[model samples]
Target: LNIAKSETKVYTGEGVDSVYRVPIYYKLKVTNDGSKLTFTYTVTYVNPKTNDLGNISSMRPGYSIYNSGTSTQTMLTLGSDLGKPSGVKNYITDKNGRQVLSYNTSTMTTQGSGYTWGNGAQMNGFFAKKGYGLTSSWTVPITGTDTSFTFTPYAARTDRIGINYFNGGGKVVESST
Candidate 1:
C-alpha cells in the first residue's frame, strides 16, 4: 500500500523568483507488469515572462537546434491565428526531411541586439519562443528506499517568471536614457 500528496507552485508576474503552477492528479491502472502508479499533469500559465527571440545572426531559438530545413523561405505573417508577435520563419528536419514554417515565441531581435547586455544573438539554428509549450521530464522510483524525480533544463533555482507581448509596429523602441 502507498499514499502521498501532490506539490504545486504559485504563479506570479515576470521577474526573478516567479513560480509555475500545474494541476496534478493521481492515477492507478492495471497492466501486464502489475499495478502501475502514474499521474495526470496540466500546464497552467497565470503570468509568464517574455523572452527575446534573437535574429538570424548566429543562433535561431534553440541551443539544441540540430539541422535546418530546406523549404521555401516565407515571411512571417502578422496577426494570424498563430497569435501575437506574429509567426517567424523557421527550419526543421523531421523524419521526412527539412521543412519551413512560421514560429512564434514572443519577440524577435537582431544579432547585435541580444549580445552582451541582451539575451544573445539568433543563429542559423532553430528558435525557441515564448507562450509556446514546455519541455520537461519526471522519473519516480517504484521500488527500494530510493525515491526521487528529475526535471530537465533544470536551473539550480528558478530566478524569474513572466509573459511575452509583441509590438504590432515594425520599429523597436530604444531607450535614450
Candidate 2:
C-alpha cells in the first residue's frame, strides 16, 4: 500500500464531500408487530477533512430518496431528521413512475437534485424535491423490506463500501467511496 491513486480533487467544507466521513449508519431491529417496516433515518453532521460534526450539523442537508412508496411534491427539510413520522413514503418508483436508483455507478447521483449553479424560477418534472424524506429515516412496507437493496444511498467510491440489505434475493453487496 501507498498513497494509492491520486486524489485528483481536493475537498473542503461540510457541503457535499464532508458527507464522506459523516457516514450514514442504518439499523434494522425486529419487533413483534408486522405490516409496515419502520426505519429510523437520522442524519448527523461530520467532516471528511478536518473531520467534524455536531457543529453546523445538518448543513446543506438535502437529497433525493429511494424506496418503495407512493410519491408526493415537496422541498427538503432543514436540520436533522428530514423525514418525519413515516417520512410519508419511500418507493423506488415515484408518482411519475420513474425508477429511482439509489446511485448509478455509471450516472453518478445519490438523491437527485438541480440548481448546480443558482435558480430563481424553477419547476421540475422529476427533480423538484418530490419528497421530504430523501435525507431522513423512513418507513416502507414489510413486503418491500423483504427484498434486498442498498440501504444507504450514497457511496464514496467504486469499492469504498456501504451497507446493504439482503432481502428476498440471496445475495450480499457492499459500497465504496
Candidate 3:
C-alpha cells in the first residue's frame, strides 16, 4: 500500500516581498512495503512585479525523526528519491566525505558551500533524532524542487518534516508535514 500527504500555502513577505502570492507545494509519499518515507517540496513565484507572485526561490528542508533502536543517538538517514531538479540531483558530502545529511553536533552560523549548513541552532539536531535532507540552502525557480529525500525509519507517528524558504522579495516562509 502507498500512503501520501500534501499541503499548499501562500504568504505575504516580511523579508521577501517580490512575489506576494506564494503558493508552495509539499508532498510525503510512503512506499509501504519497506516503510520508506519520501518528501518532495517545491514552490511558484506567482503574480509578481517581475516574477513576484511572491512564490519562492531558495529553500531549507529539515526532518524530526525518532528511530528507537536503543541507541542514545542513532543515525536518521535518507536521500533524494528523485532527481526532479538540479539542486537535489547529487547528494552533498562534507570534508570527511560524509553525506552532509549527518546529524549536526555543532551550531553553524553561515551558509558555507559545504557549510552554511542551515540555522543549525534551530533547524538541525535533536528532535527525536536530528539530521538533514539534501542541504540547508537550495535555490531554483517556480519549477524549483527544493528538498527531495527518502529514508526508511524502523517510522514516524511518521516524524514531522519541514520546509522553509525565501520568496522573490527574500521574505521567509515555512511549513511542515
Candidate 4:
C-alpha cells in the first residue's frame, strides 16, 4: 500500500521569515508471516531561494520505530550504524569518498552524497545536498504476530517527529504499500 502527505509551513530553525516546502514519501510492505514490516522512506527538499540564506544546503535525517499495541506503544530495537566510529556526531559518511555537497555554478546544478548506516533505532542515515535528498530503509519488528499494523510517524502523534537540515526547511510525507 501507499500513502503520502505534502506540508508547507514556515521553517524558522535557521532564522525567521524562512519558508520552504518539503516532500516525504513512504513505501511499505508487510511479510505474510506478520512478523516483519519493511519500508522505504524518502524525504526530498528543493531549494526555492537563491540568496535568501534560508535555503537548505544539507540535511540529516533520523527516525524512530515503535510497536503499536492496544494499551501502550513499545519502541523496537533496530540494527546498527552502517559506517561510523561512535559518539553523538554519529552521522553517516561516504565510503567512496564522495563529497556530500556539490554544485556547478556553470550548470546551475547541485548535488551531495552520504554514507548508509543504522543506529539500530534509526533505520537509515545519510547527508543531502542543496538540490538533492537522502533516502533510507527500515525493517521494524511487529509484535503480537498480527496480520498488519498501522504505520504511524512520530509527527502524527506529537510535535517531536521530523528530519533536520542546516538551515530552516519543511516536509511533505507520502506513503504507499
Candidate 5:
C-alpha cells in the first residue's frame, strides 16, 4: 500500500514588496503489506538526466528510499520464513564509472541483462544469498533483461528466506514442502 500527502504553504513577506514564497511538499508512506512484514517507506525520485549546471548533468536517474517507520519491523534472518525489508533504490554511473546520484525506480523500464556479478546488492552479496537467489532490489542504469541488473521480488512472510547452510553459510533457500 502507498501513502501520499501534499501541502502548499505561503511564506509571509518581511519587507519592501511584501513578496511571498509558496512551497509544496509531498510525503508518501508505503506499508509492506504486499509482501509479509509491513513497514513504512518513503520514495523520492528526481530526473537523472538533467542539464542544470550549464550542461552539467545532475544524475542519470535520481532515486532514494527512506525507511519511514520500522517501529515494529522485523527483517527475517537466515532460515527464517520471511524476506528483507527493502524498498526502491536507484544508482547511476557516468561514463567515468563514477556513481552520480539516482533514485528513479519507477522509470526502470529497461530490464537489466541478468548479470549476477556486480550490479545490485541482491544479485552478488548478502541479500542475494549467492547466485542461488535473486536480489530483493532492482538495479539502476538498467541496460537489458537480466543484463546489467538483477531483481528479487520481496516475498514477505513466505517460506522463502535466505539460507546459511550451504557453502559455508550464504544462500537463499526457496522453501520446499
Candidate 6:
C-alpha cells in the first residue's frame, strides 16, 4: 500500500521588520513493499508575494521518525549545501546530486565580504538561494504488515526571512558600515 500527504502554511509577519511572511511546504509519502517500507519527505520555502520558490538560503531543515507503539523518536537530519555542521552523519544525495554527510563544519569566507565572520558569508549569504527543495528517501525492513511510523518535518524551523533590510520604499539597503 502507498500513502501520501502534503501541506502548506504562510508565516505572516515573520520578516525582520515584522511585515512580510514566507510560505512553507511539507510533503510525505510511504510505500510498503513486502517486508520493506520506504518513506519519502520534503520541505520547501516559497515567497508568495515575490513569486520566489525554493530559496533555502541560511535555512536548516530536519525531521523526526517516531514509532508510536514503542514511544521512541529518532531525529533525521536533512541534506544541505553545507556539510554536516552538527557532526551528525546522515548520508543522502542532495538536489545538487552531491553526497551530503553534513554541512561545512568550519569557518568560511568569500571575496568582497568579511570572510572570517560569524557563520561566514560563504554559508550565511544568498549563494545557496537556489530553488532547491530539501528531500530525502529512506527505506527500512519491517517484520509485520501492521507496523506504522510517523515522519514529521520540523515545522517551526520552516521559518524564513523576508526582504526587510530594505528602504521604506522597498529597496535593498546597501551599506559599507
User: What TM-score does model 5 achieve against the real structure?
Assistant: 0.17
Off by over 4 Å in 2: 1-32, 46-135, 143-147, 155-177
lDDT of 5 by residue, 1-177 (tens): 654432222111111101111111111222222223221211111111221111212221221112111212222221233332334453432322234444344212221322122122212112111111211232122122221111121211112223211112111222322
The TM-scores of all predictions, comma-separated, are 0.20, 0.25, 0.19, 0.27, 0.17, 0.36
Provide C-alpha RMSD values for all models, in order. Answer: 19.9, 18.3, 17.0, 15.6, 20.0, 16.8
In the range 1-177, model 1's lDDT, one tens digit per residue, is: 564444333222221111222211111111111122121111111122222222223423433211111111111211111112212222222212223332322223222212001121122223222222221111222333222221111111111111111111121221122
Score residue 109 of candidate 3 by CA lDDT.
Answer: 24
What's the lDDT for all of these models? 0.20, 0.24, 0.24, 0.25, 0.22, 0.30
lDDT by residue (100-152, candidate 6, tens digit) is 44332222222121111121111111222343333444454545434333232
Question: Candidate 4: where are CA atoms >4 Å away?
Answer: 1-18, 22-35, 46-132, 140-145, 154-177
Model 5 per-residue lDDT at 12: 14
lDDT string for model 2 (102-163, tens) is: 32211111232210001111112133223211222234343322322233222122121222
- Mark the 10 consecutive residues where model 5 has the least summed lDDT: 11-20
**Top model by lDDT, which number?**
6
Model 1 lDDT, residue 157, Cα: 16
Best of the candidates, TM-score:
6
Residue lDDT tens for model 4, 22-77: 33322222232244444432223322233212233333343222111111221122
